[PDB]
Design an enzyme around this catalytic site. Structure first.
Site, PDB file in Angstrom:
ATOM      1  N   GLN A   1      -1.621  -0.981  -9.018  1.00 10.16           N
ATOM      2  CA  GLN A   1      -2.618  -1.865  -9.612  1.00 10.16           C
ATOM      3  C   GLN A   1      -3.955  -1.739  -8.901  1.00 10.16           C
ATOM      4  OE1 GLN A   1      -1.220  -5.795 -10.453  1.00 10.16           O
ATOM      5  NE2 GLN A   1      -2.881  -6.084 -11.931  1.00 10.16           N
TER       6      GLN A   1
ATOM      7  N   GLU B   1       4.397  -0.581 -14.307  1.00  9.48           N
ATOM      8  CA  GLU B   1       4.155  -1.501 -15.413  1.00  9.48           C
ATOM      9  C   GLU B   1       3.109  -0.930 -16.369  1.00  9.48           C
ATOM     10  OE1 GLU B   1       2.378  -5.207 -13.858  1.00  9.48           O
ATOM     11  OE2 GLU B   1       1.910  -3.992 -12.089  1.00  9.48           O
TER      12      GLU B   1
ATOM     13  N   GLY C   1       5.379  -3.191  -4.025  1.00 12.24           N
ATOM     14  CA  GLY C   1       6.613  -2.423  -4.026  1.00 12.24           C
ATOM     15  C   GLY C   1       6.456  -0.995  -4.518  1.00 12.24           C
ATOM     16  N   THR C   2       5.835  -0.817  -5.685  1.00 14.77           N
ATOM     17  CA  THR C   2       5.664   0.534  -6.215  1.00 14.77           C
ATOM     18  C   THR C   2       4.625   1.336  -5.439  1.00 14.77           C
ATOM     19  OG1 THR C   2       5.417   1.828  -8.245  1.00 14.77           O
ATOM     20  CG2 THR C   2       3.953  -0.051  -8.001  1.00 14.77           C
TER      21      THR C   2
ATOM     22  N   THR D   1      -1.021 -12.474  -0.270  1.00 12.43           N
ATOM     23  CA  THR D   1      -0.755 -12.589  -1.694  1.00 12.43           C
ATOM     24  C   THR D   1       0.729 -12.667  -2.024  1.00 12.43           C
ATOM     25  OG1 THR D   1      -2.817 -11.444  -2.262  1.00 12.43           O
ATOM     26  CG2 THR D   1      -1.085 -11.405  -3.908  1.00 12.43           C
TER      27      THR D   1
ATOM     28  N   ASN E   1      -9.041  -6.684   2.371  1.00 13.26           N
ATOM     29  CA  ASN E   1      -9.858  -7.436   1.420  1.00 13.26           C
ATOM     30  C   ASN E   1     -10.631  -8.573   2.079  1.00 13.26           C
ATOM     31  OD1 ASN E   1      -8.951  -5.783  -0.609  1.00 13.26           O
ATOM     32  ND2 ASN E   1      -7.472  -7.255  -1.429  1.00 13.26           N
TER      33      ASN E   1
ATOM     34  N   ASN F   1     -14.155  -3.005  -5.227  1.00 13.56           N
ATOM     35  CA  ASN F   1     -13.897  -1.675  -5.749  1.00 13.56           C
ATOM     36  C   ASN F   1     -15.174  -0.855  -5.879  1.00 13.56           C
ATOM     37  OD1 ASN F   1     -11.332  -2.662  -5.929  1.00 13.56           O
ATOM     38  ND2 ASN F   1     -11.264  -2.739  -8.166  1.00 13.56           N
TER      39      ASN F   1
ATOM     40  N   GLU G   1     -14.224  20.041   8.345  1.00 14.99           N
ATOM     41  CA  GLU G   1     -15.013  19.682   9.515  1.00 14.99           C
ATOM     42  C   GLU G   1     -14.737  18.246   9.924  1.00 14.99           C
ATOM     43  OE1 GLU G   1     -19.080  20.988   9.547  1.00 14.99           O
ATOM     44  OE2 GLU G   1     -18.748  22.309   7.826  1.00 14.99           O
TER      45      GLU G   1
END
Ligand SMILES: Nc1nc2c(ncn2[C@@H]2O[C@H](COP(=O)(O)OP(=O)(O)OP(=O)(O)O)[C@@H](O)[C@H]2O)c(=O)[nH]1
Ligand SMILES: Nc1nc2c(ncn2[C@@H]2O[C@H](COP(=O)(O)OP(=O)(O)O)[C@@H](O)[C@H]2O)c(=O)[nH]1
Ligand SMILES: [Mg+2]
Ligand SMILES: [Zn+2]
Ligand SMILES: [Zn+2]
Lengths: 430, 55, 53, 49, 43, 51, 55, 442, 91
Positions: free
Chosen positions: H10, H70, H143-144, H178, H205, H227, H253
């Site tokens: 995500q 997902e 998890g993923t 989270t 974050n 982002n 380098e």
């Protein structure tokens, strides 16, 4: 990711009718079954709860079971009743008699094969199946006995899926049924082995919500079943709409359940406030968090201040910043630190979904795993022991055929559940 | 050499159903810690099948 | 805010200034006081501004 | 049923419905379940008729 | 904060969804499909 | 003011929504909330619905 | 005072500026761990908390 | 002359949207993939080639895959504005998530999806002629991202061998959190990241929220701001491949100058003229001022304080109007400071780069427009302090086996917890030992 | 809570006043229940007082959910591990 619903008994069928009204409204389905919605976002996840009929129409993936058709006849006569598939209504010819043993052993085994046939027909049609969802009361007769029977059969047949129950439980102050302790104890015994996650609601808490918080002049069972349908439809919202931090039933279970027996949860829904008082205060993430932890908005009679939170989850619906959510959850955990179990570094999971229910800017549903549920089980075990020592009504159950050893097993299993909750409440690192 | 998925594509009973009325007896009640073994309860169900896990 | 650092009174939770912490339990850092003071987010809102640290 | 074959499922009104009146289904506004909003209380076996 | 030094808002300013500063208002970039399936199926 | 069943009550002649704020425009219940059916990545800023 | 308090906030003193002090008489040296403890893995015969019921 | 981006889960897909938005707008490719060019053979450029390839119909397509378990986020990409930019095979989506379990991703579910990803990466690598590394975006808290990111890095490391793999990783913040199970997934992730990455950049974050509150004037930041900052950093590092400059810097380098020992590859990142429009009116932006800015801990994108450690190497990338003499004067002034310390075995602590292309401005963005910027990536022993806070949370949960039954039921031995925790203890001791001044004869 | 002298004095006064108020309230309730003030009702009143529940508290020192780790380290003697270890570098 498809859910299959089962509605059992009077309470289950009545709550279900309001639930399917709320869901059909949220997806813009006409009571004729035709899609009439106004955004593609509504259509793109309709499969989650609806099956597709050919031209316009959609049909809802639900099985209705009862031993006398009276409740079903009331829901079929209602304004949305026509949407339900005729073949999905299963009924007998004589009532449950408000007796668990009849519902489980005598009329249960007579009907159960046709219910399993319908549930299998519905399950095997999905391209990928998510958990089952069941609504029933634990104090009743056909609800308790056949709900737990069906749950056991589905757990044998589908052990890799999720099993979810919504369940109504006896108030601490006034009984609706005399034999409630037996039916409750036997059902909790069945659930603690078979179930993955179970939510409990007190009718007394819904009455106090309606009279005190919403100040309704003449509340009706439609309001209580709307509150329940609102929270139920909120738990699934991240399955079926986009969001900044997606969530899933399995992800909720993984974050909420520390050990497999501790899977009984409290529920609440936050933006409850009377139409007169709405002008004084606006909607904001601090306001939602304050209502969310206010015991006024929690659907059980037990209060959190007598226990400790192992884990909690909050699902937010609406367009909002992540900064406010994160800082609110940190501030609440730090300021009330004695009520949070110290050997877990962070007890709250958050999730954020873009699409609120119509006419509210934002909403949150709260799920809490709190040790104060032990007081309910202790009270039920006390009332059970009072009745059982004196054989108060036991001849009905023994005449149906139950061994008394079943009663002693169920009592022992519930007593061990209470002990396990009490031990984890007072545990320490040392 | 493996099955396509961890979820079973092979199963004895599917949409045909099974005789469940003959399995319920009042003298064969459920006992403590005798529930269905499930991966959520901590039992490795995947080890029973032939699905090859990542090394 | 109750428990702010700008008062002589100590309205923080019990043993907050010497709580179990990653500088104390299973570790031993000379900078334990600094990191204990920094990670007190709702209590240093004047010192840090509206910042986490 | 074994009654006369000319009977048909009756017609119910259920007035004061928010969804039919250009209003949201707000909390505590389910007027169509109020018994004063119905026209009759007689239960009829609609599942057979 | 204080709003006593803030500039006024003119009557012709678009404060609705059409006036959002985004990729639409940047007239250098063209959002009309030119090559692909959508441009092929366009009337 | 009165106490009934252990809770406070107010007569609805002094507890009611405001009668002002009539904008003179027609809207469906889906148009009450601005940005009802748009996501954050589609539009990360908040604004009134376009006329 | 060339390095400073290394970002730490010290209680003021009527005279001079205070400086942080290390453990015992050791010089101040943040970022270095004096005593690291890794707990042992559980014994093979230990009871699994999710295995059964009761306390 | 090209780099391939792999986006996982995500956070990695959402950061990818901002990155590809920026790279499109900077090169000039339209949302449908078209770009006008010159009609005469020989008068044309190539800077797009690092990130785009053109089709025979003249559509441009980017060298990226998007991987998720997902559907929702990839379907959001499929229905958004950039629908026509990506090739549909590149957007790969499974049926169901890894449910915050590293074990589910690694053993059960990622094992099904991993071979499609490897086939797509192979199809990309065959359409290259000077591939010089992989860029990977993922979070280790979920998890993923943890399980499939580790499994995929292992497979890539076997198949491609010596080719470099550079990771940008969102690590669990030290007090913002989270999900409950974040420590287990991050601990199990770090072992794979230890073995199978050449340089790893760490992000939190909580630091970017602090940076957007303090420097920018944003009361209610959201993930799109973070982002966009990450995208700017990546654009600054890859600009050296794409535009003319005085002192170019090839990706090899970076590894040669920044990595002293093969395990000591975790680096801190910061960016200088993060400033609001109002501030631009009242602030000069000389070379030496932004160089002084890059050293403030308020500028960092990871929540660590470098004053609690020692620097081993710094790499400073200047883009815009800079003259080498001013860079030299700035670096000599930094070297003079006594609050900035280098390990005594690293006397020549700095690498410089100078590129002529100034940073691009994005229509919805919050950064001001500026004529020059500098970006730094640096290796410092202070990072050992970052791991300790995750390990303490692991010890707290693991003392009671708080959630382990999920991992053991979904296919993992209990032993893996103790192995990973011992590996992180050894990595902490390595960073303690490498940072110790001098030695003795006894 | 706070450790000032004023707070300690207030806490002690609160404890004494709460004890007295609880006692007088219980006697008033029992007198209302029985409508008598004889000596024969004292045993049942004491039994009801014993049966009366109280709200729980999680800040007690008996389960001790809030350890003071720096004081514990000072008392035990964790002043630093000389000569290094298998996981600590020597100073
Ligand atoms: N900076 C930033 N952090 C993000 C973003 N999205 C998620 N995160 C963070 O990353 C962590 C969550 O990881 P996810 O990416 O949601 O995990 P996942 O890859 O989806 O794994 P599964 O849940 O099993 O599908 C949390 O700490 C989030 O705060 C993002 O867009 N930007
Ligand atoms: N909230 C709610 N509770 C209900 C409803 N109908 C019944 N109940 C409660 O459920 C219990 C009765 O169980 P019941 O449904 O009659 O069991 P059954 O006879 O097997 O169907 C009592 O506590 C009722 O108060 C309903 O529509 N809503
Ligand atoms: Mg996810
Ligand atoms: Zn005081
Ligand atoms: Zn008397």
């Amino acid at each position: 990711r498809e859910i299959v619903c089962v509605q059992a008994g009077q309470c289950g069928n009545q709550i279900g009718s309001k639930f399917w009204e709320v869901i059909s409204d949220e997806h813009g389905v006409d009571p004729t079954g035709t899609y009439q919605g106004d955004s593609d976002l509504q259509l793109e996840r309709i499969n989650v709860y609806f099956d597709e009929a050919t031209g316009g129409r959609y049909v809802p993936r639900s099985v209705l079971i009862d031993l006398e058709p009276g409740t079903m006849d009331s829901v079929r006569a209602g304004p949305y009743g026509q949407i339900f598939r005729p073949d999905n209504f299963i009924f007998g010819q004589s009532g449950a008699g408000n007796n668990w043993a009849k519902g489980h052993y005598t009329e249960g085994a007579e009907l159960i094969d046709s219910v399993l046939d319908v549930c299998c027909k519905e399950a095997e049609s999905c391209d990928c199946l998510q958990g089952f969802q069941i609504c029933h009361s634990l104090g009743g007769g056909t609800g308790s006995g056949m709900g737990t029977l069906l749950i056991s059969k589905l757990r044998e047949q589908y052990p890799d899926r999720i099993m979810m129950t919504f369940s109504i439980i006896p108030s601490p102050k006034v009984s609706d049924t005399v034999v409630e302790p037996y039916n409750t104890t036997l059902s909790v015994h069945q659930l603690v082995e078979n179930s993955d996650e179970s939510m409990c609601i007190d009718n007394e808490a819904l009455y106090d919500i309606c009279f005190r918080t919403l100040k309704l002049t003449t509340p009706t069972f439609g309001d209580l079943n709307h509150l329940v349908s609102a929270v139920v439809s909120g738990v699934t919202c991240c399955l079926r709409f986009p969001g900044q931090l997606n969530s899933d039933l399995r992800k909720l279970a993984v974050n909420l359940v520390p050990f497999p027996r501790l899977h009984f949860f409290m529920m609440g829904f936050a933006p409850l406030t009377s139409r007169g008082s709405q002008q004084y205060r606006g909607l904001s993430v601090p306001e939602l968090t304050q209502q969310m932890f206010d015991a006024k908005n929690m659907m059980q009679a037990a209060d959190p201040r007598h226990g400790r939170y192992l884990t909690a989850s909050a699902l937010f619906r609406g367009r909002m910043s992540t900064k406010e959510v994160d800082e609110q959850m940190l501030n609440v955990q730090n300021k009330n630190s004695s009520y949070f179990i110290e050997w877990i570094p962070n007890n709250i999971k958050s999730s954020v979904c873009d699409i609120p229910p119509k006419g509210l800017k934002m909403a949150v549903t709260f799920i809490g795993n709190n040790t104060c549920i032990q007081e309910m089980f202790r009270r039920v075990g006390e009332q059970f022991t009072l009745m059982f020592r004196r054989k108060a009504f036991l001849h009905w159950y023994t005449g149906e055929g139950m061994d008394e050893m079943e009663f002693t097993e169920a009592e022992s299993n519930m007593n061990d559940l209470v002990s396990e909750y009490q031990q984890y409440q007072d545990a320490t690192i040392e | 050499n493996t099955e396509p998925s961890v979820h079973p594509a092979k199963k004895p009973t599917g949409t045909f159903g099974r005789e469940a009325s003959s399995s319920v007896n009042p003298s064969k009640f459920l006992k403590k810690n005798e529930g269905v073994g499930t991966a959520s309860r901590g039992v490795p169900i995947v080890d029973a099948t032939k699905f090859v896990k990542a090394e | 805010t109750e428990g702010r650092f700008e008062t002589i009174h100590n309205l923080r939770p019990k043993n907050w200034d010497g709580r179990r912490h990653w500088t104390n339990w299973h570790h031993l850092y000379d900078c334990e006081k600094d990191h204990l003071a920094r990670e007190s987010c709702p209590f240093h809102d004047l010192r840090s501004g509206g910042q986490f640290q | 049923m074994k009654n006369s074959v000319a009977r048909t499922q009756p017609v119910r009104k259920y007035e004061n419905f928010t969804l039919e009146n250009n209003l949201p289904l707000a909390l505590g506004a389910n007027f169509h379940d109020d018994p004063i909003c119905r026209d009759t209380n007689r239960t009829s076996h609609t599942l057979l008729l | 904060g204080k709003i006593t030094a803030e500039p006024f808002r003119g009557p012709n300013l678009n404060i609705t969804q059409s006036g959002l500063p985004c990729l639409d208002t940047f007239k250098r970039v063209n959002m009309t499909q030119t090559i692909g399936k959508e441009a092929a199926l366009a009337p | 003011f009165d106490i009934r069943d252990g809770a406070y009550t107010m007569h609805p002649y002094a507890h009611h929504p405001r009668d002002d704020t009539a904008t003179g425009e027609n809207y469906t219940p889906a148009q009450i909330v601005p940005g009802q059916y748009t996501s954050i990545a589609r539009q990360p800023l908040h604004a009134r619905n376009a006329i | 005072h060339s390095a400073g308090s290394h970002g730490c906030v010290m209680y003021p003193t009527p005279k001079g500026v205070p400086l942080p002090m290390g453990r015992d008489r050791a010089p101040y040296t943040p970022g270095v761990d004096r005593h690291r403890i890794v707990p042992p893995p559980p014994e093979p015969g230990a009871h699994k908390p999710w295995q059964g019921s009761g306390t | 002359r090209e780099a391939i981006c792999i986006h996982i889960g995500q956070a990695g897909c959402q950061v990818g949207n901002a990155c590809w938005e920026l790279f499109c707008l900077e090169h000039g490719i339209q949302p449908d993939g078209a770009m006008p060019s010159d009609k005469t053979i020989g008068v044309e450029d190539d800077a797009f080639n690092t990130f785009f390839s053109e089709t025979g119909a003249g559509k441009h397509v980017p060298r990226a895959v998007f991987l998720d378990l997902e559907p929702t986020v990839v379907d959001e990409v499929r229905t958004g504005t950039y629908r026509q930019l990506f090739h549909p095979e590149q957007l790969i989506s499974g049926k169901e998530d890894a449910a915050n379990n590293y074990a589910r991703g690694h053993y059960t579910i990622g094992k099904e999806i991993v071979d499609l990803c490897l086939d797509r990466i192979r199809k990309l690598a065959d359409n290259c002629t000077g591939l010089q590394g992989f860029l990977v975006y993922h979070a280790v808290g979920g998890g993923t991202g943890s399980g499939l990111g580790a499994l995929l890095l292992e497979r890539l490391s076997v198949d491609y061998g010596k080719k470099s793999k550079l990771g940008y990783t969102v690590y669990p913040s030290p007090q913002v959190s989270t999900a409950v199970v974040e420590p287990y997934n991050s601990v199990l992730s770090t072992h794979s990241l230890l073995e199978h990455t050449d340089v790893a950049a760490m992000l939190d974050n909580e630091a970017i929220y602090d940076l957007t509150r303090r420097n920018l004037d944003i009361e209610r930041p959201t993930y799109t701001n973070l982002n966009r900052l990450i995208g700017q950093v990546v654009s600054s590092l890859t600009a050296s491949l794409r535009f003319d400059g005085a002192l170019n810097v090839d990706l090899t380098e970076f590894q040669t100058n920044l990595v002293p020992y093969p395990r000591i590859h975790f680096v801190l990142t910061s960016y200088a003229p993060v400033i609001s429009a109002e501030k631009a009116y009242h602030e000069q932006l000389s070379v030496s001022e932004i160089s002084n800015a890059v050293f403030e801990p308020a500028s960092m994108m990871t929540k660590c304080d470098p004053r609690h450690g020692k620097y081993m190497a710094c790499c400073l990338m200047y883009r815009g109007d800079v003259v080498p003499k001013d860079v030299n004067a700035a670096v000599a002034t930094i070297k003079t400071k006594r609050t900035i310390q280098f390990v005594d075995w690293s006397p020549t602590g700095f690498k410089c780069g100078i590129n002529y292309q100034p940073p691009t401005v994005v229509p919805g963005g919050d950064l001001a427009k500026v004529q020059r910027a500098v970006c730094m990536i640096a290796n410092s022993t202070a990072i050992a302090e970052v791991f300790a806070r995750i390990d303490h949370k692991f010890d707290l949960m693991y003392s009671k086996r708080a959630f382990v039954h999920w991992y053991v039921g979904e296919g993992m031995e209990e032993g893996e917890f103790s192995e990973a925790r011992e590996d992180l203890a050894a990595l902490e001791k390595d960073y303690e030992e490498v940072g110790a001044e001098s030695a003795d004869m006894d | 809570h706070c450790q000032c002298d004023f707070c300690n004095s207030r806490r002690n006064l609160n404890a004494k006043k709460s004890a007295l108020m609880t006692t007088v309230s219980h006697l008033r309730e029992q007198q209302a229940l029985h409508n008598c003030c004889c000596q024969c009702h004292d045993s049942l009143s004491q039994r009801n007082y014993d049966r009366k529940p109280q709200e729980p508290s999680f800040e007690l020192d008996d389960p001790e959910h809030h350890p003071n780790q720096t004081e514990l380290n000072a008392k035990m003697g964790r002043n630093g591990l000389q000569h290094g270890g298998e996981y600590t570098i020597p100073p």
